[PDB]
Every structure is written in structure tokens, then in C-alpha cells.
């Protein structure tokens, strides 16, 4: 379902980066993949995917994406504190 929605298999390539369009579902898979036991590179990808969001965050804030930044933190939020309780 997730391979579907994400636009490639992260399951194949094992060494590439996460996709990050459409990160709400990038952090589905993440936490499906945590339930499936790769919870050492689940926590990998976790910490990679902050500093995108972070930096996403922070390089694309005009005053038009205020929507997308308030869900965009909302998210960042979720992501911290699964990094913290896998941690």
C-alpha cells in the first residue's frame, strides 16, 4: 500500500535516502518499517528525515505557505517524538 503511494520501493534500494514528497507518508513507512524489526535503520532514516523536514521547513517559509508550514511542524512534531521513545 505504502510502496504504492511513495513512488518507488525504498524496499529495493536499501542504501538510497527516503523519498520526502509527500511526507506524511514517507513517515508511514518509517513506522511501519519500526513494526517489521528494522528498528536500527528505521531510526536511521528517522533522524535523516527531521533534518529535511527541518530544513524544508526553514528554506521554503514565504508568508504564502503558512497552511503547509503549520502541518509541516504538526508533523516535525510526531517525527521528535517517535526519535525520542525508539532512542
Not at 538510497?16 to 536511521?44: E, G
Not at 523536514?53 to 526553514?58: F, G, H, L, P
Request: charged share 20%; glycine share 2%.
Amino acid at each position: 500500500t505504502l510502496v504504492l503511494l511513495l513512488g518507488v520501493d525504498p524496499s529495493r534500494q536499501l542504501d538510497h535516502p527516503l523519498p520526502t514528497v509527500h511526507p506524511q507518508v514517507t513517515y508511514a513507512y518509517m513506522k511501519n518499517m519500526w513494526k517489521s524489526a528494522r528498528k536500527i535503520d528505521a531510526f536511521q532514516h528517522m533522524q535523516h528525515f527531521v533534518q529535511t523536514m527541518q530544513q524544508q521547513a526553514q528554506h521554503a517559509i514565504a508568508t504564502e505557505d503558512q497552511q503547509h508550514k503549520q502541518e509541516l511542524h504538526k508533523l516535525m512534531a510526531r517525527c521528535f517524538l517517535k526519535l525520542g521513545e525508539w532512542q
